[PDB]
Amino acid sequence: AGEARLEEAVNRWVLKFYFHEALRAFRGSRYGDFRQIRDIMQALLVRPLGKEHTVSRLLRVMQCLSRIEEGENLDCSFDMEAELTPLESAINVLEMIKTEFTLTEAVVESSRKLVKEAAVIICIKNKEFEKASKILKKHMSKDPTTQKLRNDLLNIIREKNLAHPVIQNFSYETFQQKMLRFLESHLDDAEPYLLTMAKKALK
């Protein structure tokens, strides 16, 4: 079972390569390609990887981006025992990122606020007003940075006013790319080893 250390090394190379290409697809708004690469990484995760700090950090970011990418699909669940919307799950992953990456509350508060805003607004646009109130109460009633935002969303929910500028001016594309720029700023930017060896093979 020295072949086990061989597969572990290759699986790490493969995981890091497809993570690099998944970030590239997300950056280019090629979310279909991101989905397909995400599914490759999911299947690979059942295999032995040894372990790094790099793998744990990239899998957390991959976890967060995948929930954000599915955030407008309220039929999707990332915990079948829970009843969380995808963007609610993204909030929970962000908190795990804050703890495991040892980030301050000041560094994560703005981007976390963006997820809270999107989580409530998506429920509003699906006319899931009861879920929107539950997310609003849980995640904004205490957050000091979302007090004005909470004030606007409370009236939108009560009036069921999907035509409010807060709802209509919201851009999920802008939200997604802001989240990627934040998450990428906390990761190593090196090119994966498989990519470098591919460039030399095609020379």
Binding site: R35, R38, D39, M41, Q42, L45, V46, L49, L59, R60, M62, Q63, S66, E70, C76, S77, F78, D79, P86
Partner: peptide
Amino acid sequence: XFXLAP
């Protein structure tokens, strides 16, 4: 080890 996709 994580659930990436639904």
